[PDB]
Design a protein around this ligand. Structure first.
Ligand code: NAD
Ligand code: NAD
Lengths: 459, 459
C-alpha cells in the first residue's frame, strides 16, 4: 500500500443501499484505516454481509427531522467525514450540521426530507448557502451527476489539442464556457449504454436494474428536462418553460421515459436512449453559458440519452404497461449478471473534427476483479465518490462545492484505475445519417445537431 | 396407436423452416405412415437434423415461377397432400396446380411470388377462385390466423350458455354474426402473451423470437390494420380508409409495432400489446358482420394485441433504435429457452357477464414432453395445422376454404391435446380501470370498449 492514505479520524456513512455497500471496498482499499474508524447508520437492514465482512459497526435507525441533530450530531467530531449515501434525508440539514461539527461531507445527490419538490429548488436552497459554511461539502458527486462533469472538461481540452489549439487550462466557468463556444459545441449528451445481462432471466412483476430501481422509476416519471442551446432553431410542440424557474431549461409534457433521443456510444454506436431527466443538467448548462452581462451569447443544449440494461428496458416497458404503476417488487442485479459492460460518458457535438465521445467503458468482468459487491454500474459511481472523498480531505475548508468547481484531472487520475478503458472517440455519425425510409421523419438537413433531428418524433 | 390415421398416399411438404420442422413430429404421431411417404423441398438447408432423425427425403431446390410446374407437379399424384409451409412462393399458383393434380393442399398463410403487395389483394386474388377448383385447399390455417377463428366460435357459444341462452350451433356466417351481436360483443382481440425466457441472454445485433424473426419484423413494419366496429364513436387522428380497399378496415399512419393497445390475458392480466397487423382481421370482421342488404347493422372491432417474448421485445426496441433497419442477424429460440409459456387466445368484450378470454396457455415444459423440435409457440401452430390436415383428408373435395368455414369443435378436439390448458376466463377488467394519474389520458367513461380508451395515446 504505497498509495494508502493515512486517516486518523472516522467515516460516518448514513445509508447502506446500492451505493453504500459498493463503497466499502474502495474505502479500505484507499485508506489505511481501521474498521473501528467506520460506522454505518441505516433505516433498513440488508440480506448482505458486507458490513460483517469488514467488521464495521451497523446501527439500525430511521433518521428524522426530530432526531437527526442528536443521532447524527453525536457521531461527528471535528474533521470527521459524513459520507451521505441515503435517501429521504435533508442534504441541506445534514450539510449545516456537519459544518457546526466541523466535519466533512459528501453526497451523490441532493435530497429533501421524506414526504415531489422540484429538483431546481432543492439545489438553489442548498446553493444559497455558499458563503455561510466553512467546512467542505462536495455535492452531487457520483458518476452522473459528478464524474460526467469531469469528463466534459477533459473532452473539451482533448478536442482543443486535436484542433491544433494550444491554450492554458481554463479556471473559472466563463473560460470553460468560452472554450466550448470557440470549439463549436452545439450540444452535449450524457450518453450511457448498459449492456449487463443476467441469469436467471427477468420475472414478471418486478423492476430490475443495475442500480436503484426506484431512482430510475422516479426519474422516468418526471417530465423531460433539457438545457436549451442557443443554436436550436426549432421549438418542440409539447415544450414549455418556467418564467421563474431555470432560464436555461425547457421541459416536455411527456414523461422522460416516454421520450427517445438519438445519441452515440463507441462500443455499439448509434442508438436510441431515454431522455431521462437529471440534476446536473441545469448546473452544467449554466456552467457553459456565456453572456456580456444580461444578454446570453452562447449556450449548448444539454440532456441525458440513457439506455439501461436490457432488464431495465423490459422493466420500463412493463411499468408503462401497468399504466405507470410501479411493480410491487424491485431487484438489484449484481451477482446474477453474467456478461456485459456499462459505457458511461459524454458526447460533444458541433466541432469540425466530428462528434466526440469521452468516457468509461467498464465490463462486469473487470469490475469484479477490481472490487467485490460491485457491478459495472455501481463501481463507476463509487470510483467517483472515493475520489471526491479524497479531494475533500486535502481541501477541508472550501464550503459547499459542486463537481464543476473541482479540478477534473485530480479526480480522473484517482478514479481511472476503477473505470476500465477510458478515453475519447471521434465519429462521423450524426442523427441525420443511417436514417430509414419506411417512415420519413421530418428533418433539418441544415444542421444535424438540431434537437428537431435528435428527438425521435413518432409523428 | 388406437387413433393412428391410415394414409396410403404421400405428404409433400415444401419449405422446412420454423413451422415445417416443428410439424414433422405431429405427422408421424397422428399418421401410421412410412417415412418414404414423406418428401421435403426447400431452398436453404438447415443446421438441424430433423429430417435425418425421421429418415425423410430432403431436396435442396429453389422453387420459381419457371420451374414450379415441373418440380412440384411431378411430385404430386391424385389424393396426395401438399403441405405448404414456405415463403415467397405463390399460394395461388400452388393451389391451382394441386387441383390439376387432384392433390390436397394447406398453408398457414397466403403468400405471393418472391419480389409489398397488400395483404388484401392476395386474399381476394385467391378467394376469387372459390367455384373454380374441386379439391380442398385449406388456407391460413395456423394458430393465428387459424386456430383463433375456432376459439372465437367456441367463446361465442360458451358466453351464450353462461347467459342462460339455449340455441343451436349456428351454421352460416350470418348466424355467427347474429349471435355475436345478440351477445353485445363490441370488440374482439386476439390477445397473446409470450413469456418464454432464455439462456444465454440476447446479444446485440440480432432479432430473437420464438418464431420467424422476419415474419414479426415485416408485420411490425406495416401500418396498423383494424376492423372498425359499428359501436366506435371516436375517429383516430392518424386514421384513414381505402375507398376501394376493404370497407370494414381502418388503418393508422404509424407502423403497427409503434401502436400499443390495452388488452387482457388470464395468466398475467391487463397488459399493453403491440397492435401488430394480420390477415384474419378482415376475414373475421366480415364473418361477424350483419346487414339487411347494403346497409351494415352490426360489426365488432377486431385487431391483434400482441406481446412477444421478452427477447422479441428487446429486438423490436433495437429495431426502432436502428431506424427500422432490421438487424443483420436473426435467431429462433428453441433449446435456449428455459422457462415460460405462450398464452394465445381471443378476448370478447361487450357482454354483461364481463370480458371473456378463451384460448391456449402452453408452457415450454409441457410442449417439450409432448413433442420435440417445438417450443410453446411453434407447437400451437403445428397443432392447428395437423388438425386442419386431418380435416382436409376426410373432406378432400371442398375447394378453397378458410378456417371460418370449418367446424370449430372438430379442430379443437384434435388440437386440444397439444395446447396445454385450454378454456375460458371471465374478468371484470376494462381499459378504464387501474388507470394511472401521473399523466391523465383522455378517456370515454361512457363506453370502456371504445377504441379511444384502448389505444395507448402518448398525447
Ligand atoms: N451520481 C450518481 O452516479 C449516482 C448513482 C446512483 C445513486 N446516486 C444517489 O445515491 C443515493 C444513495 O442511495 P442508493 O442508490 O444506494 O439507494 P438505496 O435506496 O439502495 O439505499 C438508500 C439507503 O438509505 C437509507 N435511508 C433511507 N431512509 C433513511 C432514514 N430515514 N434513516 C437512515 N437512512 C435512511 C435506506 O435504509 C437505504 O439503506 C441517492 O441519493 C441517489 O440519488 C447517485
Ligand atoms: N397461422 C400461424 O399461427 C402461423 C405462424 C407462423 C408462421 N405462419 C406462416 O408460416 C410460414 C412458414 O414459414 P416459417 O415461419 O417456417 O418461415 P421460415 O422462413 O423459417 O421457413 C420458410 C422455408 O421456406 C423455404 N422457401 C422460401 N423460398 C423458397 C423457394 N424459393 N423454394 C423452396 N422453398 C422456399 C425456405 O428455404 C425456408 O426453409 C409463413 O408463410 C408464415 O406466414 C403462420
Amino acid at each position: 500500500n504505497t498509495k494508502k492514505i493515512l486517516f486518523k479520524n472516522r467515516f460516518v456513512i448514513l445509508g447502506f443501499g446500492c451505493v453504500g455497500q459498493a463503497l466499502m471496498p474502495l474505502i479500505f482499499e484507499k485508506f489505511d484505516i481501521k474498521p473501528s474508524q467506520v460506522t454505518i447508520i441505516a433505516a433498513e437492514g440488508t440480506k448482505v454481509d458486507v458490513a460483517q465482512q469488514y467488521g464495521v459497526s451497523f446501527k439500525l435507525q430511521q433518521i428524522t427531522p426530530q432526531n437527526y441533530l442528536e443521532v447524527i450530531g453525536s457521531t461527528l467530531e471535528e474533521n470527521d467525514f459524513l459520507i451521505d449515501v441515503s435517501i429521504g434525508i435533508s442534504s441541506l440539514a445534514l450539510i449545516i450540521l456537519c459544518n457546526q461539527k466541523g466535519a466533512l461531507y459528501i453526497n451523490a445527490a441532493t435530497e429533501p426530507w421524506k414526504e415531489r419538490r422540484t429538483n431546481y429548488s432543492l439545489r438553489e436552497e442548498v446553493l444559497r448557502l455558499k458563503d455561510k459554511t466553512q467546512k467542505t461539502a462536495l455535492i452531487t458527486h457520483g458518476a452522473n451527476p459528478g464524474l460526467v462533469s469531469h469528463f466534459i472538461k477533459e473532452a473539451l481540452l482533448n478536442i482543443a489539442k486535436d484542433n491544433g489549439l494550444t491554450i492554458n487550462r481554463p479556471k473559472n466557468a466563463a473560460e470553460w464556457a468560452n472554450l466550448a463556444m470557440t470549439l463549436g459545441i452545439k450540444v452535449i449528451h450524457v450518453a450511457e449504454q448498459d449492456s449487463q445481462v443476467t441469469y436467471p432471466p427477468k420475472s414478471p412483476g418486478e423492476f430490475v436494474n443495475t442500480w436503484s430501481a426506484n431512482g430510475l422509476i422516479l426519474e422516468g416519471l418526471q417530465p423531460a428536462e433539457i438545457g436549451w442551446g442557443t443554436h436550436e432553431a426549432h421549438w418542440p410542440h409539447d415544450a414549455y418553460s418556467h418564467s421563474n424557474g431555470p432560464q436555461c431549461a425547457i421541459y416536455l409534457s411527456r414523461p422522460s421515459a416516454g421520450v427517445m433521443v438519438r445519441s452515440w456510444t463507441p462500443t455499439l454506436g448509434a442508438f436510441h436512449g431515454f431522455l431521462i431527466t437529471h440534476a446536473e443538467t441545469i448546473s452544467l448548462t449554466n456552467f457553459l453559458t456565456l453572456k456580456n452581462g444580461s444578454e446570453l451569447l452562447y449556450r449548448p443544449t444539454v440532456h441525458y440519452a440513457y439506455n439501461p440494461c436490457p432488464d431495465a428496458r423490459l422493466s420500463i416497458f412493463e411499468l408503462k404497461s401497468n399504466e405507470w404503476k410501479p411493480q410491487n417488487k424491485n431487484r438489484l442485479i449484481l451477482n446474477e449478471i453474467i456478461d456485459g459492460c456499462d459505457e458511461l460518458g459524454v458526447l460533444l457535438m458541433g466541432n469540425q473534427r466530428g462528434a466526440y465521445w469521452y468516457g468509461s467503458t467498464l465490463s462486469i468482468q473487470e469490475a469484479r476483479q477490481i472490487a467485490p459487491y460491485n457491478n459495472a454500474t455501481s463501481l463507476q459511481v463509487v470510483a467517483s465518490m472515493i475520489s471526491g472523498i479524497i479531494w475533500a480531505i486535502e481541501h477541508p475548508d472550501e464550503g459547499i462545492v459542486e463537481p464543476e468547481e473541482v479540478d477534473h484531472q485530480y479526480i480522473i487520475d484517482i478514479a481511472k484505475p476503477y473505470l476500465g478503458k477510458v478515453g475519447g472517440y471521434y465519429t462521423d455519425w450524426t442523427p441525420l445519417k443511417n436514417r430509414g425510409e419506411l417512415y420519413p421523419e421530418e428533418v433539418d438537413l441544415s444542421d444535424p445537431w438540431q434537437f428537431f433531428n435528435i428527438r425521435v418524433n413518432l409523428e
